[PDB]
Amino acid sequence: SGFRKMAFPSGKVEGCMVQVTCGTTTLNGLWLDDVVYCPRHVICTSEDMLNPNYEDLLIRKSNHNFLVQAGNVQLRVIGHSMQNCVLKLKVDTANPKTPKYKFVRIQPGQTFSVLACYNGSPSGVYQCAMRPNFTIKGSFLNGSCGSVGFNIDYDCVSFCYMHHMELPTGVHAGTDLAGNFYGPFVDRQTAQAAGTDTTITVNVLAWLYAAVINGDRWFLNRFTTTLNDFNLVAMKYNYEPLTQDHVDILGPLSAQTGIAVLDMCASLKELLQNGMNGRTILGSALLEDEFTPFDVVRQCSGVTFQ
Amino acid sequence: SGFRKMAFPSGKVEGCMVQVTCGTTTLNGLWLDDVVYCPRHVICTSEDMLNPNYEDLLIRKSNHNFLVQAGNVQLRVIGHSMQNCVLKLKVDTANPKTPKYKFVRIQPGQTFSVLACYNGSPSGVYQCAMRPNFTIKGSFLNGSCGSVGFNIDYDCVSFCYMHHMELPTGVHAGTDLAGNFYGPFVDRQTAQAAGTDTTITVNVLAWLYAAVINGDRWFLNRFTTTLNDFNLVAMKYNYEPLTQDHVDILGPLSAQTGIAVLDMCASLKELLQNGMNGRTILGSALLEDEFTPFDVVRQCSGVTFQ
Ligand SMILES: *[C@H](O)[C@H](C[C@@H]1CCNC1=O)NC(=O)[C@@H]1[C@@H]2[C@H](CN1C(=O)[C@@H](NC(=O)CC(C)C)C(C)(C)C)C2(C)C
Ligand SMILES: *[C@H](O)[C@H](C[C@@H]1CCNC1=O)NC(=O)[C@@H]1[C@@H]2[C@H](CN1C(=O)[C@@H](NC(=O)CC(C)C)C(C)(C)C)C2(C)C
Numbered sequence: 340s341g342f343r344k345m346a347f348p349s350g351k352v353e354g355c356m357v358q359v360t361c362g363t364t365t366l367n368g369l370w371l372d373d374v375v376y377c378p379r380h381v382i383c384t385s386e387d388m389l390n391p392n393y394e395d396l397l398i399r400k401s402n403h404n405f406l407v408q409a410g411n412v413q414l415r416v417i418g419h420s421m422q423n424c425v426l427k428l429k430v431d432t433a434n435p436k437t438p439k440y441k442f443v444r445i446q447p448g449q450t451f452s453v454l455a456c457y458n459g460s461p462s463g464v465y466q467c468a469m470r471p472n473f474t475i476k477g478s479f480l481n482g483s484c485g486s487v488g489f490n491i492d493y494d495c496v497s498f499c500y501m502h503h504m505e506l507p508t509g510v511h512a513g514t515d516l517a518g519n520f521y522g523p524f525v526d527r528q529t530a531q532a533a534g535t536d537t538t539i540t541v542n543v544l545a546w547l548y549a550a551v552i553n554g555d556r557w558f559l560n561r562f563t564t565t566l567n568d569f570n571l572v573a574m575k576y577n578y579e580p581l582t583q584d585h586v587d588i589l590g591p592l593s594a595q596t597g598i599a600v601l602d603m604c605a606s607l608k609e610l611l612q613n614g615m616n617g618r619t620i621l622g623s624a625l626l627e628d629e630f631t632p633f634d635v636v637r638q639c640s641g642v643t644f645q
Numbered sequence: 646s647g648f649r650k651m652a653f654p655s656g657k658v659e660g661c662m663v664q665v666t667c668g669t670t671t672l673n674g675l676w677l678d679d680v681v682y683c684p685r686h687v688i689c690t691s692e693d694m695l696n697p698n699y700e701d702l703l704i705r706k707s708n709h710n711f712l713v714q715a716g717n718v719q720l721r722v723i724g725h726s727m728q729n730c731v732l733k734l735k736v737d738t739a740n741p742k743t744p745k746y747k748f749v750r751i752q753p754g755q756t757f758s759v760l761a762c763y764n765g766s767p768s769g770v771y772q773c774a775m776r777p778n779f780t781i782k783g784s785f786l787n788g789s790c791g792s793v794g795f796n797i798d799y800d801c802v803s804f805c806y807m808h809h810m811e812l813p814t815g816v817h818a819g820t821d822l823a824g825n826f827y828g829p830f831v832d833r834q835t836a837q838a839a840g841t842d843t844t845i846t847v848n849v850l851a852w853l854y855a856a857v858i859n860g861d862r863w864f865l866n867r868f869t870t871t872l873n874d875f876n877l878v879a880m881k882y883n884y885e886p887l888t889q890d891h892v893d894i895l896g897p898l899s900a901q902t903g904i905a906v907l908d909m910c911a912s913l914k915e916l917l918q919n920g921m922n923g924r925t926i927l928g929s930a931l932l933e934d935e936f937t938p939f940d941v942v943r944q945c946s947g948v949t950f951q
Contacts, residue, residue, distance in 0.1 A: 343784040
């Protein structure tokens with residue numbers, strides 16, 4: 340037992356992290372086969388980042404302007420090209436540590452592991468969810484750009500996120516590995532607002548199931564509710580509407596615990612309307628929404644990767 | 646900005662994890678140079694674990710009873726010996742992935758990263774603190790024994806924890822890498838109680854400093870308090886007494902924020918006596934105590950490892 344916010348083991352990604360320096364900008368790149376991916380705002384100066392035209396900026400660059408360091412070994416850039424908001428630097432060596440991988444774009448509500456990195460050196464690993472407003476609540480300082488987010492499914496790393504920037508609220512924005520931003524953001528140093536967030540309803544329910552699996556049962560009840568009447572409570576507390584496919588994906592957890600999905604909704608309704616009254620659930624005094632049904636089933640069952 | 650519970654990158658440890666099977670017990674071992682370390686209760690049967698005499702049990706074992714698998718490659722056991730509650734299995738290959746390492750015993754209040762492992766395959770990574778009662782609030786299922794806990798300081802892995810067992814409250818107990826248990830526990834399947842816990846006071850204060858660094862300031866005040874009068878509040882709420890060395894270690898954080906340590910204690914006092922009134926601190930509705938002053942300074946400054 341126990342329930343922790345748990346990231347994937349990071350080793351396979353650590354082996355791909357490199358340092359990319361252009362001019363007076365240094366950030367991280369991701370080295371897979373003979374390509375290094377990194378955020379395109381590395382080509383910019385401090386007064387370039389204020390309103391840049393990246394095509395104009397990149398045609399003035401050459402291969403030798405890109406210093407790529409795989410630890411203490413310099414990689415030679417032999418080509419460069421821009422794909423949306425990422426740069427693809429072709430180097431003269433293939434990464435011998437290249438894992439089996441995919442580039443996948445995730446849905447809001449889904450989770451991933453972030454390997455925070457500085458100067459090409461991994462610093463820490465933690466779990467994040469893609470918020471409904473396409474931001475992520477991360478931990479990122481100067482020089483963390485190009486750190487990636489990922490999931491691991493057996494031996495294959497599915498990269499879903501590259502870090503680009505921090506919004507004024509202290510949340511973080513970035514792209515998939517094809518360089519397309521999550522959300523209505525641009526890699527420009529001007530004011531941009533995140534869009535109003537919501538709580539990920541199906542994730543809260545999954546976490547309640549994790550709690551029951553772990554022996555927290557004080558919030559259970561013999562009441563029930565229709566899906567329709569749950570959602571009138573949901574909109575009232577800025578929770579996402581629940582769909583029948585969310586009920587279906589909660590099916591296995593419903594089955595293991597013997598608590599019908601709609602019964603657990605009645606419990607969530609009561610927690611929303613009354614609060615917790617000085618109690619906790621899995622060591623939290625808040626309703627937690629950054630665990631997916633998948634996350635619960637992995638941790639409360641025990642899947643591995645090789 | 647941002648503040649996350651952040652583990653060390655796990656790659657260096659992933660390369661040391663192996664599967665150890667004896668009889669009908671399988672668990673994880675830690676493979677460093679030509680030795681595999683694992684919990685000694687692997688030699689036991691189901692009715693051995695109820696009241697075992699381990700010296701008697703081990704003299705009846707031989708090298709060939711220990712099946713060690715480094716992935717899909719079998720390691721050959723050429724010696725075995727018992728050091729307290731761990732076994733040391735000498736194998737015929739040195740691990741070529743052996744990091745620079747140390748075996749260190751940590752103090753309650755200190756934190757470390759756990760690489761949860763099943764069948765020799767790493768499953769996830771997360772952060773833990775050693776509770777004042779020498780337990781840890783982990784996430785561990787059947788077969789997770791032998792997963793280790795560690796810190797990383799530049800290139801050197803300091804191993805501090807090996808997992809052995811789960812107490813009836815759902816907390817976890819284990820040993821340092823010399824096989825000496827943390828706390829008054831034995832590797833015996835009988836009832837054992839954890840001892841009463843306390844909150845790690847200096848850690849809460851460090852986390853309040855992390856919050857200020859990140860822009861949560863609503864709990865600040867212009868009141869102050871003497872160290873003496875803070876501790877009368879501390880014992881009242883089951884918090885650890887604060888010492889002058891805790892004030893000293895909080896010095897740098899005190900300096901960056903400009904909030905005197907004793908001023909922050911006055912704030913903690915008020916949070917203890919009034920609660921939070923529907924507000925959060927760094928996304929938590931509870932006072933968090935599993936971040937050390939070191940943890941705050943790493944995350945709010947950005948140290949790496951290579
Ligand atoms: C790249 O490592 C860096 C990572 C930032 C620094 C602090 N925390 C982070 O996540 N990104 C940038 O510096 C980013 C590039 C310049 C300005 N950038 C910012 O993130 C800005 N943020 C904004 O100007 C506001 C948003 C809407 C852009 C700050 C945090 C440095 C002020 C690019 C080209 C956007
Ligand atoms: C080893 O992988 C396993 C890990 C446990 C299983 C569930 N969660 C864990 O952390 N350890 C053991 O099975 C452990 C060995 C036998 C009994 N063990 C237990 O942890 C017991 N716990 C107790 O009997 C109570 C404590 C005081 C020992 C349970 C959880 C399996 C009932 C050893 C020799 C103690």
